[PDB]
Scaffold this active site. Structure first.
Site, short mmCIF file in Angstrom:
data_model
loop_
_atom_site.label_atom_id
_atom_site.label_comp_id
_atom_site.label_asym_id
_atom_site.label_seq_id
_atom_site.Cartn_x
_atom_site.Cartn_y
_atom_site.Cartn_z
N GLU A 135 0.78 -1.22 0.00
CA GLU A 135 0.00 0.00 0.00
C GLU A 135 0.83 1.31 0.00
O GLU A 135 0.91 1.98 1.03
CB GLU A 135 -0.96 -0.02 1.18
CG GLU A 135 -2.01 -1.11 1.16
CD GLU A 135 -3.24 -0.74 1.96
OE1 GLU A 135 -3.15 0.15 2.83
OE2 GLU A 135 -4.30 -1.34 1.72
N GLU A 251 -5.65 -8.30 -0.03
CA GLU A 251 -6.49 -7.97 1.10
C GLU A 251 -7.92 -7.68 0.67
O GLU A 251 -8.15 -7.03 -0.35
CB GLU A 251 -5.97 -6.72 1.83
CG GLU A 251 -4.56 -6.75 2.39
CD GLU A 251 -4.24 -5.56 3.33
OE1 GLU A 251 -5.18 -4.86 3.75
OE2 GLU A 251 -3.05 -5.35 3.66
#
Length: 319
Positions: A135, A251
């Protein structure tokens, strides 16, 4: 030495070891890694374990940027538990936000981290996968993200000629970003996104998200909600086909604050949509049930049980 597209098959549906090793120090958040978690994950039917790792506090902040031997040992031990059970196992750098906030100043250090990771795990099984950076967000630019992936990949390939490396782009490994990255000219790669759309639904009341309170009560499940997921997954599948690179959803999750019918449905539909198209998945699981503030949980590490209803949605087709 294994084709990425077979690896994505073998990966199937899986889990994150959430809030564990990516916390400042292991145990400061959810409970430290234990060998029995893997027995349980196996028995649950997960075929992969993604293991978030924050290297920051275990790595020197001056030259030569060494990683504490002890900490690599600890990570090797947890990885070994995973590989022993036949899991596709993924380590990364997670929450190492220092490199995102000042790419220019810190890239030397990040390079050094990954040199050492690459070294320690050079001899592991092909089912150990490196994921470069969880991320990217904030100050770091798309250009810098592309530069990083190419840079770090090169360092890895010195000692890991053929191990599969996982790469994504900016805006929290959004799919919008994945689709636009510069893919290095390498045949052992997988691309990743994190799917939390709609964000206001999936993150309602998340205490670490300024403004969360105001989304409380949001439902999910309409025809349009479902159409959107399909349109977006098609789009990602096309990128996968065009660029001949498999896709990995590292995720996805929903706050337990979410309406229970909505919550379970969302897990069901995302799994069924990703898997239909050959995507690998790892569900997000932080092991937190109280307060609801912090709940994106499935597996209780104390009672050693699972939210069975959700677990079933991950592996089974809904209607």
């Amino acid at each position: 030495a294994v084709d990425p597209f077979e690896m994505v098959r073998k990966m199937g549906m899986g889990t994150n070891l959430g809030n564990t090793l990516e916390a400042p120090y292991e145990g400061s958040w959810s409970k430290s890694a234990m060998e029995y978690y893997f027995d349980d994950f196996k028995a649950a039917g997960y075929k992969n374990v993604r293991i978030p790792v924050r290297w920051d506090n275990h790595t020197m902040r001056t030259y030569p940027y060494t990683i504490d031997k002890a900490f690599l040992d600890r990570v090797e031990q947890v990885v070994d538990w995973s590989l022993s059970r036949g899991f596709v196992t993924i380590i990364n750098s997670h929450h190492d936000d220092w490199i995102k906030e000042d790419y220019n100043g810190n890239i030397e250090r990040f390079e050094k981290i990954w040199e050492q990771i690459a070294e320690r795990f050079k001899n592991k099984s092909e089912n150990l996968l490196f994921e470069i950076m969880n991320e990217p967000f904030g100050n770091i630019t798309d250009e810098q993200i592309d530069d990083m992936n190419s840079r770090i990949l090169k360092i890895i390939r010195k000692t890991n000629p053929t191990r599969i490396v996982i790469i994504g782009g900016g805006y929290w490994n959004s799919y919008n970003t994945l689709v636009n990255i510069k893919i290095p000219d390498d045949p052992y790669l997988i691309g990743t996104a994190h799917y939390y759309d709609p964000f206001e639904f999936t993150h309602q009341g998340a205490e670490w998200v300024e403004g969360s309170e105001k989304w409380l009560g949001r439902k999910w499940g309409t025809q349009e909600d479902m159409d959107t997921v399909v349109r977006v997954f098609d789009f990602v599948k096309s990128w996968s086909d065009r660029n001949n690179i498999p896709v990995y959803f590292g995720e996805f999750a929903v706050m337990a604050y979410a309406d229970r019918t909505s919550r379970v449905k969302w897990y069901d539909f995302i799994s069924d949509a990703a898997l239909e198209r050959g995507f690998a998945c790892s569900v997000w699981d932080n092991g937190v049930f109280g307060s609801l503030d912090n709940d994106m949980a499935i597996y209780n590490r104390d009672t050693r049980t699972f939210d069975t209803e959700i677990l079933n949605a991950l592996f089974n087709p809904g209607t």
